[PDB]
């Protein structure tokens, strides 16, 4: 919002913005260290070794 006398508000004054995840629900860890991954499921009607 901004009044016509020149005084405005910004999103930096209302909220604290910043980049992060879109869902903090699941976050794995491998062998002690922080990690992540992508669990791959196989397509049906196809073998596993070529995939």
């Amino acid at each position: 919002k901004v009044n016509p006398d020149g005084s405005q508000v910004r999103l930096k004054d209302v909220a604290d913005v910043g980049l992060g995840g879109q869902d903090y629900s699941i976050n794995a860890q491998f062998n002690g260290s922080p990690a992540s991954g992508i669990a791959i499921k196989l397509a049906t009607g196809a073998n596993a070794l070529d995939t």
């Binding site: 006398d5 020149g6 005084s7 405005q8």
Partner: protein, 40 residues
């Protein structure tokens, strides 16, 4: 065999810290004429 980097060493320096503020001008002396008498 190892490439070189173009570098700029920085040292201490004083600054002035300007800030920018919006807002519109108004005149020093506005005197809108008002009649304080009646007639045509």
């Amino acid at each position: 065999q190892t490439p070189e980097v173009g570098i700029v060493t920085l040292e201490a320096q004083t600054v002035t810290l300007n800030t920018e503020l919006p807002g519109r001008t108004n005149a020093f002396r506005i005197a809108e004429v008002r009649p304080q008498v009646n007639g045509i």
